[PDB]
């Protein structure tokens, strides 16, 4: 079966050049279009480039034609978006995307990888445990998580326990903090009475900065009747 | 360029209804339109395609129609796993995408279960105190979180986000946190958050005493 996979992003000064991949299997670009289609908050969804089957042909959207260069490598059945003097407004998710003719739909799409273009440094998250503890508690289930502090730019990615424990998770909306700063928060519901035995590790990536974090989160003694 | 506007931007329902959502291109596409779904953290999900031609995989309920500049996308009877963005695409021209229709769902009322967090033992050794409020599977989504420190009503030190609905039993989630630096943590003793919400007879008490654990 088909899929796509993109590599590359990250944070990159205004007139920064960036290059993106996208790996396919299940199929060739050498006998599809590959086509690149951006996403962000207040543009929807912006088609951006493509390559034809037989490569002889390359396409681009008026607002990156002359900086954007799309090319393949057969061998390696990828696809790439080479960007040059990139600006604020290319700012967004790149979407490989591909179509057996041009008046096929888009059927299989990447992943999505992000592209920010700021002036601003990076800064990594500090993630610390939301532990459980009877005031995490209620009926037979506890409540646990992280909580991924202070990173720039955005997004920060989370997962738990490398991705095998998904059912009852809740990764929320980063907020802005006053510092130009970001955070979030990812919780799961679990049996309580799981936690004498159940590992909960959460897996947060910012690609920005270049990090990777896996974080336990343990069990805490907060049952108290009177207060020391 | 043909330019896509989708109506209405926000379109909500219940489960088993007949939902309707319109796109109409700045000038004819000649049924080159294309329709995709989209979920928070999610590629775009081909639906469509080529006016009325049903992908394959996706349930029979999806239907397209239209022709001109005016096309429609039909779902039959709506089902929980159907809240997203919609988003239609001409390939007329040079491709354009509309900017969407978010479809959200209302249901029976569903109280929230309310969780608290003391700061970690890292956090406060960095010279930060955050204190985090959970409100986990409610409907509908409007509730209202008060942060009391020693019963006293706290304001400007908190942040709040909501999720995206939830595909399985149409719910949200509300997470809260309360930040103060240690030096500011350190001159209370109860903290405590309240929660009102159209499920709870009257507002649930959550709270610790700080340095209990
Ligand atoms: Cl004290």
């Known amino acids: 079966e088909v899929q796509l996979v993109e590599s590359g992003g990250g944070l990159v000064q205004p007139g920064s050049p960036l290059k993106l991949s996208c790996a396919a299997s299940?199929?060739?670009?050498?006998?599809?279009?590959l086509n690149w289609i951006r996403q962000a908050p207040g543009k929807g969804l912006e088609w951006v480039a493509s390559?034809?089957?037989?490569?002889?042909?390359?396409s681009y959207s008026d607002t990156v034609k002359g900086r954007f260069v799309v090319s393949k490598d057969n061998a390696k059945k990828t696809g790439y978006l080479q960007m040059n003097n990139l600006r604020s407004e290319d700012t967004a998710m790149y979407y490989c995307?591909?179509?057996?003719?041009?008046?096929?739909?888009?059927?299989?799409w990447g992943q999505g990888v992000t592209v920010t273009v700021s002036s601003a440094s990076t800064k990594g998250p500090s993630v610390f445990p939301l532990a459980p503890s009877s005031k995490s508690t209620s009926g037979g289930t506890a409540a646990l998580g992280c909580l991924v502090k202070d990173y720039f730019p955005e997004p920060v990615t989370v997962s738990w326990n490398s991705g095998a424990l998904t059912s009852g998770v809740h990764t929320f909306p980063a907020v802005l903090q006053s510092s130009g700063l970001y955070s979030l928060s990812s919780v799961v519901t679990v049996p309580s009475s799981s936690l004498g035995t159940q590992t909960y590790i959460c897996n947060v990536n910012h690609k920005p900065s270049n990090t990777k974090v896996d974080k336990k989160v343990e069990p805490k003694s907060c049952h108290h009747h009177h207060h020391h | 360029d043909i330019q896509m506007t989708q109506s209405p931007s926000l379109l909500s329902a219940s489960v088993g209804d007949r939902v309707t959502l319109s796109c109409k291109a700045s000038?004819?596409?000649?049924?080159?339109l294309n329709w995709y779904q989209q979920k928070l953290g999610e590629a775009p999900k081909l639906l469509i395609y080529?006016?009325?031609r049903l992908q394959t995989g996706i349930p029979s309920r999806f239907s397209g129609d239209g022709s001109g500049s005016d096309y429609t996308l039909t779902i039959s009877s709506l089902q929980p796993e159907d809240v997203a963005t919609y988003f239609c695409?001409?390939?007329?021209?040079?491709?354009?995408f509309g900017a969407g229709t978010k479809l959200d769902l209302k249901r029976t009322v569903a109280a929230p279960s309310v969780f608290i967090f003391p700061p970690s033992d890292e956090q406060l050794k960095s010279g930060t105190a955050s204190v985090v409020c959970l409100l986990n599977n409610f409907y509908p989504r409007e509730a209202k979180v008060q942060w009391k420190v020693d019963n006293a009503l706290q304001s400007g030190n908190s942040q709040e986000s909501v999720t995206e609905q939830d595909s399985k039993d149409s719910t949200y989630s509300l997470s809260s946190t309360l930040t103060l630096s240690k030096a500011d943590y350190e001159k209370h003793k109860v903290y405590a958050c309240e929660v009102t919400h159209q499920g709870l007879s009257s507002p649930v008490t959550k709270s610790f005493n700080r340095g209990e654990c």
């Open positions: 390559i034809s089957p037989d490569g002889g042909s390359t």
């Open positions: 695409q001409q390939y007329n021209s040079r491709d354009t």
């Open positions: 299940g199929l060739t670009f050498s006998a599809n279009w």
């Open positions: 000038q004819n596409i000649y049924n080159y």
């Open positions: 995307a591909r179509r057996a003719t041009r008046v096929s739909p888009f059927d299989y």
């Open positions: 080529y006016t009325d």
